[PDB]
Amino acid sequence: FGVLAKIVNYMKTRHQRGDTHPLTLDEILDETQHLDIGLKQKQWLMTEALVNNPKIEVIDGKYAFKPKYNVR
């Protein structure tokens, strides 16, 4: 679950890049040096619990658009 908040921080720096694009969890876990096993499944249960309260927006489809106010 802590690694999950770390993924949130990662996507926050991703916003900071400005190259935010519709993504998924596997590529982030790879780029953050973490694996894809049943651990990813339990942390994805936690991640969907996050999707129930993702003030930092994490939607399932085309997503990650956190800022409630966002133009450039």
Partner 1 sequence: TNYKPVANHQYNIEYERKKKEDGKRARADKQHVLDMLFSAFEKHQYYNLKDLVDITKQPVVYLKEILKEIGVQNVKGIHKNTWELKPE
Footprint of partner 1 on this chain (CB under 8 A)? Answer: 1-6, 8-9, 12, 54-56, 66
Spatial neighbors of 47 by CB under 8 A, at least 6 apart, are 4, 25, 58
Cα 9 from chain centre: 8
CB of 18 to partner 1, least distance (A): 19
Instruction: CB nearer to partner 1: give 23 or 56.
Output: 56
Q: Which residue, 2 or 38, is less far from partner 1 as judged by CB?
A: 2
Residue with smaller CB distance to partner 1, 23 or 34: 34
Using a 10 angstrom Cβ sphere, with 0-12 exposed, 13-18 middle and 19 or more buried, the burial of residue 34 is middle
